[PDB]
Design a protein around this nucleic acid. Structure first.
Ligand SMILES: C[C@H](Cn1cnc2c(N)ncnc21)OCP(=O)(O)OP(=O)(O)OP(=O)(O)O
Ligand SMILES: [Mg+2]
Ligand SMILES: [Mg+2]
Lengths: 554, 414
DNA sequence: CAGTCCCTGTTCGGGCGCCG
DNA sequence: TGGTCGGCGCCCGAACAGGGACTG
């Protein structure tokens, strides 16, 4: 029936009315159902019939449920929602199979017509008015309104969830040693008691819910391990995701690629080393999700590559609060990375990827940090703690990167993991001038109205050179100039610059950039055996400065 | 003595806070929870539901050398939405006396605040959502009935009944200056700790059996103040070794307009070789020690306008070295200092940067009764990740994240 | 001084996945 | 025939935002 639980106060958006839209024709199938449902509800009192006095109306329909055979009534409360107040969603995130701890006794149990058991505020009921049309569409349609939370109303969730808790509170309060991973209406009930005491207690829970108006129909996995929960299969000692079929085709569209990458993304939590950089890059050209995109070799692999990883069946284990938490990462290639968390050598709790290209000029160590970061986070959202790491970077590569970096950066208790490809800097700029080294004086300008420009330098050996520029910027110049001074320099150099832009970009020790030019600049710096770089206040009479700037001018 | 509740309006033209609660350790959830239950079991708070569109983040802080915990909420979002209440209507003068005051002492007493009901029509804004590990149970909400610590109005109201509680001392000890910020109370004096510390133990029993309860302690920020802009001393001066001191003394000019370049700038005009040692002039070398004479003479133009926001930029100088510049306007730093790693501490960027951010601010207050908007040198995500781990100040200053390298070897370096 | 440009970040929202 | 809602993840794009160098 309907539960006693007190209802939740809900107002409309200040100075606004209720819905008032009609009903679009529905198949004779739906209607044939929408009725059979309502009859049952009305009689059960889940909704009362309304007359002329209710000046409101919103549209409905039905979508089939999982198993099917049964229908789900839904109301297009789109409008009402916009017109309703706001709510503070109370579902913070999602639980993770890898977060469950070992239990001697587990069971699960969805709740029957959840939404339709929780009372909906007396007043608001007006708006929830809707109409069930007929077959021939001649005789007027039947008009009703809800008393219990309607399916698809901007607030239903938060209210159901809120409600439930309050309802379970007493039971939880009186049986602390029982855990209950509640998700909306689905209930995960574990404990460490014997089949006896446990199933005994389970029943108590069950009657208590029913007592409060909540139904636990036989759709409750008992001694049914593998319990089905949240998309996984809960075995006594391990879990896993359910069938994760990928779409096998020939003519690919943006939509497809989307349902693909997404589906793979779901996998990435357990099947190690999934990757999508290439496939999802295939979705930069904002277009119709119907628009046929061309699959590229580059990515054609990434598909079939991952398509293989999914052939191997896999599983994960659960959490032990006694053993420590390890996280180890590896570099999958193009700025991508794959980590796996665990406590036991080849007993993976969870696995995860990371391919966020942050910035325009970065390095592996920069990324390898924002990984630790991302990991640290979720590992707390899941285990409420911070995992020790195993990093493919040398205790010293790091020691260097921070004591020498200007910004503050940190990485939790970790330890080296010798296993390529290892991480490291590809060049450490000289912190002092290299004696007996053709000290260069670089610079380059550009006209912002013609988009043309010049770039060049000079040296303590008089050596002079300059190059013309197309569409270049007041920026592209300085660089373009630093680019040559390298190729026009041997193992040991000494370039001096006025521009901060390029100096800073360089001091970052980048080794990855979408900036074409910057690439070579780096690559060159890698070939050189030593390079010093200093800065001088541009446009102020300074030795060597003058001449260079002077030379390149328009 | 709890009768009257003061009406509080949200600065019209606005709306309330709606900031999501972020991840917390399991030590902290089991924390807040054991707190938030007692706090409800004594009506300071009351559970609430999802029909309330408001939220403000929270958390705990095990107190330094104090085994017990202490709740805490990031009301920064509220205070910014209820300033006119505690700004225009309930302003604040200028307690300059503590600045110069020998030895000060910070004493937190916000604990009192809870013995004063809060405007009901307002409470709906003090909403905060405790969370759950691995997301077992949905968020557990709440609301305030009394005065929430860390709120700026909280003191702004209690301010009255406070003064009164303090007369049996303030007047019988006019020497000692007493200030109140947020949840903290300052006891600036001009005596020795052999007394000053014992005088605090007296201000304790006064506040104790008067109703309130209070959980390198002392401070004397004046015994530090600003710092120099020190220059390099050599017997030799290379091309660059000069091209540097020149560039620096170029920016150092915008702060001090009385610095000269020409004599030390003409030391070369050709594409000279960087390492060519060239100590080269009578007037240039005289100029050096001159521009060097200006860096001893504290700048001019610094006018502290309490009608604008204090900023603060900082620098990572290796080895626990952090340099800052408290300032309201471009190149006019009403104060600048340097922070050195405390004794015994380990090398951890954030752990430090924070401690810094704090002292910087602790000072800021006892020197302007305000907090500066730090322009941090770290990565959002990095900061946002561990900071909370190291904090301890019952308050939380504004802050932004920026990235800009040291090209003029920092006028402040060492 | 402004009015610009470059270049670097942040935010927000859209589409899909997964859960109920 | 395809149409609802709340959570979170990911990718991407767009709208901002702030400095530095120029110009006017
Ligand atoms: C409907 C609600 C969660 N839910 C599931 N799907 C939807 C949807 N499309 N819109 C709104 N809510 C949705 O309950 C979970 P569900 O168990 O799927 O349906 P029910 O109301 O509990 O009824 P029964 O147990 O007989 O299946
Ligand atoms: Mg159900
Ligand atoms: Mg230039």
């Amino acid at each position: 029936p309907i539960s006693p639980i007190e209802t939740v106060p809900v107002k409309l958006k200040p100075g606004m009315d209720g819905p008032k839209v009609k009903q679009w024709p529905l198949t004779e199938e739906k209607i044939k159902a929408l009725v059979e449902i309502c009859t049952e509800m009305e009689k059960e009192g889940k909704i009362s019939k309304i007359g002329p006095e209710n000046p409101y109306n919103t549209p409905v329909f039905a979508i089939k449920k999982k198993d099917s055979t049964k229908w789900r009534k839904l109301v297009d409360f789109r409008e009402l929602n916009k017109r309703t107040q706001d709510f503070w969603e109370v579902q913070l995130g999602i639980p993770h199979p890898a977060g469950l701890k070992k239990k001697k006794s587990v069971t699960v149990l969805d709740v029957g017509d959840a939404y339709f058991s929780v009372p909906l505020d007396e007043d608001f009921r007006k708006y929830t008015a809707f109409t069930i049309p007929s077959i021939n569409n001649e005789t007027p349609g039947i008009r009703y309104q809800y008393n219990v939370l309607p399916q698809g109303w901007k607030g239903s969730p938060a209210i159901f969830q809120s409600s439930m808790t309050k309802i379970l509170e007493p039971f939880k309060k009186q049986n602390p040693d029982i855990v209950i991973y509640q998700y909306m209406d689905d209930l995960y009930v574990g404990s460490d008691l014997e089949i006896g005491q446990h199933r005994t207690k389970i029943e108590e829970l069950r009657q208590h819910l029913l007592r409060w108006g909540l139904t636990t129909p036989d759709k409750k996995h008992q001694k049914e391990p593998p319990f089905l929960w949240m998309g996984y299969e809960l075995h006594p000692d391990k879990w896993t995701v359910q069938p994760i079929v990928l779409p096998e085709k020939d003519s690919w569209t943006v939509n497809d690629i989307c349902k693909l990458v997404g589906k793979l993304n779901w996998a990435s939590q357990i099947y190690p080393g999934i990757k999508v950089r290439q496939l999802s890059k295939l979705l930069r050209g904002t277009k119709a999700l119907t628009e046929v995109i061309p699959l590229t070799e580059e990515a054609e692999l990434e598909l079939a590559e991952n398509r293989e990883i999914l052939k191997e069946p896999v599983h994960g284990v659960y959490y032990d609060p006694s053993k420590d938490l390890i996280a180890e990462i590896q570099k999958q290639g193009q700025g991508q990375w794959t980590y796996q968390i665990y406590q036991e050598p080849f007993k993976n709790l969870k696995t995860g990827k990371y391919a966020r290209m942050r910035g325009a000029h970065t390095n592996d160590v920069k990324q390898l940090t924002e990984a630790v970061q991302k990991i640290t986070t979720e590992s707390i959202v899941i285990w409420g703690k911070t995992p020790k790491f195993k990093l493919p970077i040398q205790k010293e590569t790091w020691e260097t990167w921070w004591t020498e970096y200007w910004q503050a950066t940190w990485i939790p208790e970790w330890e080296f993991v010798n296993t390529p490809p290892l991480v490291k800097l590809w060049y450490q700029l000289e912190k002092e001038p290299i004696v007996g080294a053709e000290t260069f004086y670089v610079d380059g300008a550009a006209n912002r109205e013609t988009k043309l420009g010049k770039a060049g330098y000079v040296t303590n050996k008089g050596r002079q050179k300059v190059v013309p520029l197309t569409n270049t910027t007041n920026q592209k110049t300085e660089l373009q100039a630093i680019y040559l001074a390298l190729q026009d320099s041997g193992l040991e150099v000494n370039i001096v610059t006025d521009s901060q832009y390029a100096l800073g970009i360089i001091q970052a020790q980048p080794d990855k950039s979408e900036s074409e030019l910057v690439n070579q600049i780096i690559e060159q710096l890698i070939k050189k055996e030593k390079v010093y770089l200093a800065w001088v206040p541009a446009h102020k009479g300074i030795g060597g400065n003058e001449q260079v700037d002077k030379l390149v001018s328009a | 003595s709890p009768i009257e509740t003061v009406p509080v309006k949200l600065k019209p033209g606005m709306d309330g806070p709606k900031v999501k609660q972020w991840p917390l350790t399991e030590e902290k959830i089991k924390a807040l929870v054991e707190i938030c239950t007692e706090m409800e079991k004594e009506g300071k708070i009351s559970k609430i539901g999802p029909e309330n569109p408001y939220n403000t983040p929270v958390f705990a802080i095990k107190k330094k050398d104090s085994t017990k915990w202490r709740k805490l909420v990031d009301f920064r979002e509220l205070n910014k939405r209820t300033q006119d209440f505690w700004e225009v209507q309930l302003g604040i003068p200028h307690p300059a006396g503590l600045k110069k005051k020998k030895s000060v002492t910070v004493l937190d007493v916000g604990d009192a605040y809870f013995s004063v009901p809060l405007d009901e029509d307002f409470r709906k804004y003090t909403a905060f959502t405790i969370p759950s590990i691995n997301n077992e149970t949905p968020g557990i909400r709440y609301q305030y009935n009394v005065l929430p610590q860390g709120w700026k109005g909280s003191p702004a109201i209690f301010q009255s009944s406070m003064t009164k509680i303090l007369e049996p001392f303030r007047k019988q000890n006019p020497d000692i200056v007493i200030y109140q910020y947020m949840d903290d109370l300052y006891v600036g004096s001009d005596l020795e700790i052999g007394q000053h510390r014992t005088k605090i133990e007296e201000l304790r029993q006064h506040l104790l059996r008067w109703g309130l309860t209070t959980p390198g302690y002392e401070l004397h920020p004046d015994k530090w103040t600003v710092q120099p802009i020190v220059l390099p001393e050599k017997d030799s001066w290379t091309v660059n070794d000069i091209q540097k001191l020149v560039g620096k003394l170029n920016w150092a000019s915008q702060i001090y307009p009385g610095i000269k370049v020409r004599q030390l700038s003409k030391l070369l005009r050709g594409t000279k070789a960087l390492t060519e040692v060239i100590p080269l002039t009578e007037e240039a070398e005289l100029e050096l020690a001159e521009n060097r004479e200006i860096l001893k003479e504290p700048v001019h133009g610094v006018y502290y306008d309490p009608s604008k926001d204090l900023i603060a930029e900082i620098q990572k100088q290796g080895q626990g070295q952090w340099t800052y510049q408290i300032y309201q306007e471009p190149f006019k730093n009403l104060k600048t200092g340097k922070y050195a790693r405390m004794r015994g501490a380990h090398t951890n960027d954030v752990k430090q940067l924070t401690e810094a951010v704090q002292k910087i601010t602790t000072e800021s207050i006892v020197i302007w009764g305000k907090t500066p908007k730090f322009k941090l040198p770290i990565q959002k995500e990095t900061w946002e990740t561990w900071w909370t781990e190291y904090w301890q100040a019952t308050w939380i200053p504004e802050w932004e994240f920026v990235n800009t390298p040291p090209l003029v070897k920092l006028w402040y370096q060492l």
